[PDB]
């Protein structure tokens, strides 16, 4: 199984490399060659979830058989027996093993600095270039630093 | 099994080496050659967790059969029998063996010191370069030291 | 199964490449060669959902057999027994494995900037060029940036 773990590491590294390639394909025309640096971290879960759900519909029952005895005298006896049929959904789901659980991307732009408007524009391009998903916990940093 | 433990050590060292390579790929342009030093510690758990969860939904029951006797005279007798159907989820999860449980990264920058703003900018780049995850217990130190 | 995961990555990359090709086929005449850059992120779910639904119709029952005893004296006894037949739909659905769960497209247009009207017109063309589906969570960014 350790060979499987090794190949999982390979998958994660391949994903990171592909994302880096896309980042380059976007930023190389916009910024130029050597005016930026970017690295990508991709964390992938490899669990084996397998779920079975059996759901009913309480608010729409359908009476199948029914008995109702109601006699008076004073005495009032109200017996009743009822059998129901209910909407039944049975869903069996099997999640894919390796899923990107969190994605971190950081891009540093060489100074000569960059204005806030262009930094936010680059961030907007990256959002969509990488597939930024904040609800997944992903993080995207864009900074303007001084290259040596 | 000790061979398996040896290969687990190899996996941990490989992960550390990959993270060091990424750190270099980010900092070598920004800082230069020989102006920084960085080391990475990665601790990986290799447990064999395997969980089975059976969850219900108490607040939405669906009545399947029902009996209700209610007679009066004074005397008031209220018998009742009820059978329910409930939402049932059965999920079987099997966690991946080797998972990074804690990650420690330390970077030291050669003086001539570095301002706090640039130190924090480098820290921001590393956050995303390495995939910093504070909730996991990870730690990232960036210091400005005097190289000899 | 890791080979299957690799081929899933290949499928996702192929989809992204096809969408990029369509984007080029639309924007190359309109904008020109080298006046734009665009990248596409496609996230695909590969679950194995398999659902079975059994639905009834509570509001249109059909009486199959019926007994009704109603005697008087004063005393009033109203016994009743009833059997019903109900509309029964049984649908077994099996979803396709790989489905595009979210799609992100970002396009950056070289300045010399672009007016808001033409930006929105390009966005309208892309909506339909790519098959924009906001209800799916898809995202489409169109920006006017300064190419270097």
């Amino acid at each position: 199984a350790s060979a499987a773990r090794r190949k999982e590491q390979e998958l994660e590294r391949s994903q990171e490399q592909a994302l880096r390639e896309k980042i380059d394909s976007v930023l190389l025309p916009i910024l130029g060659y050597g005016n930026y640096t970017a690295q990508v971290d991709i964390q992938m879960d490899f669990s084996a979830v397998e779920q079975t759900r059996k759901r009913f519909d309480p608010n729409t029952p359908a009476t199948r058989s029914e008995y109702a005895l109601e006699d008076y005298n004073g005495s009032v006896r109200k017996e009743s027996t009822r059998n129901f049929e209910l909407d039944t959904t049975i869903s069996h789901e099997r999640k894919q093993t390796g899923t990107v659980a969190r994605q971190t991307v950081s891009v540093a732009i060489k100074d000569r600095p960059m204005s806030e408007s262009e930094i936010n524009a680059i961030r907007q391009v990256l959002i969509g270039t990488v597939g930024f998903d904040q609800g997944r916990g992903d993080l995207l940093n864009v900074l303007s630093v001084k290259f040596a | 099994a000790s061979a398996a433990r040896r290969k687990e050590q190899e996996l941990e060292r490989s992960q550390e080496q990959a993270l060091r390579e990424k750190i270099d790929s980010v900092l070598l342009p920004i800082l230069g050659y020989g102006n920084y030093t960085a080391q990475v510690d990665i601790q990986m758990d290799f447990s064999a967790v395997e969980q089975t969860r059976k969850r219900f939904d108490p607040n939405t029951p669906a009545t399947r059969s029902e009996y209700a006797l209610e007679d009066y005279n004074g005397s008031v007798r209220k018998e009742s029998t009820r059978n329910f159907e409930l939402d049932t989820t059965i999920s079987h999860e099997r966690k991946q063996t080797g998972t990074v449980a804690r990650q420690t990264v330390s970077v030291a920058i050669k003086d001539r010191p570095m301002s706090e703003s640039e130190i924090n900018a480098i820290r921001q780049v590393l956050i995303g370069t390495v995939g910093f995850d504070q909730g996991r217990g990870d730690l990232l130190n960036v210091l400005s030291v005097k190289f000899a | 199964a890791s080979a299957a995961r690799r081929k899933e990555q290949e499928l996702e990359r192929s989809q992204e490449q096809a969408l990029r090709e369509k984007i080029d086929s639309v924007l190359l005449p309109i904008l020109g060669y080298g006046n734009y850059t665009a990248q596409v992120d496609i996230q695909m779910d590969f679950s194995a959902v398999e659902q079975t639904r059994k639905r009834f119709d509570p509001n249109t029952p059909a009486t199959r057999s019926e007994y009704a005893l109603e005697d008087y004296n004063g005393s009033v006894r109203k016994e009743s027994t009833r059997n019903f037949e109900l509309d029964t739909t049984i649908s077994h659905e099996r979803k396709q494995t790989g489905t595009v769960a979210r799609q992100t497209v970002s396009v950056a247009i070289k300045d010399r900037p672009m007016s808001e009207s033409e930006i929105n017109a390009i966005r309208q063309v892309l909506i339909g060029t790519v098959g924009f589906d906001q209800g799916r969570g898809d995202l489409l960014n169109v920006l006017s940036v300064k190419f270097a």
Binding site: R64, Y67, T81, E85 | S65, E66, T81, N83 | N83
Partner: peptide
């Protein structure tokens, strides 16, 4: 007339 239930015609 159904599953675990009553209504014993």
């Amino acid at each position: 007339r159904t599953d675990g239930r009553h209504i014993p015609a």
